[PDB]
Amino acid sequence: GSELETAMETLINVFHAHSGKEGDKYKLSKKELKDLLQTELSSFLDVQKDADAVDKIMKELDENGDGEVDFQEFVVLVAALTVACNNFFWENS
Amino acid sequence: GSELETAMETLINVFHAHSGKEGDKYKLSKKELKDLLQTELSSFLDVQKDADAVDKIMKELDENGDGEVDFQEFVVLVAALTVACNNFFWENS
In chain A, the residue whose alpha carbon lies closest to the alpha carbon of B77 is A76
**Cα A51 to Cα A84: distance, rounded to the nearest angstrom:** 6
Q: State in Å, rounded, how far the first CA of chain A is from the last one.
A: 31
Q: Which pairs with CB-CB distance under 8 Å and at least 24 residues apart come from B55-58? A: B56/B80, B57/B81, B57/B84, B58/B34
- Cβ-Cβ pairs closer than 8 A, A with B, add up to 71
Radius of gyration of chain B (CA): 14
**Would you say B49 and B83 are in contact if contact means Cβ atoms under 8 Å apart?**
yes
CATH superfamily of A1-93: EF-hand (1.10.238.10)
Looking at the complex, report in whole angstroms how far the Cα of residue B65 sits from the nearest Cα belonging to chain A: 21
What would the DSSP string read from start to end of B18-75?
Answer: HHTTSS--SS--HHHHHHHHHHHTHHHHH----HHHHHHHHHHHHH-TTS---HHHHH
**Cα B79 to Cα B86: distance, rounded to the nearest angstrom:** 9
Q: Residue ranges of the domains in chain B?
A: 1-93
Annotated binding site of A for Ca(2+): 27, 32, 62, 64, 66, 68, 73
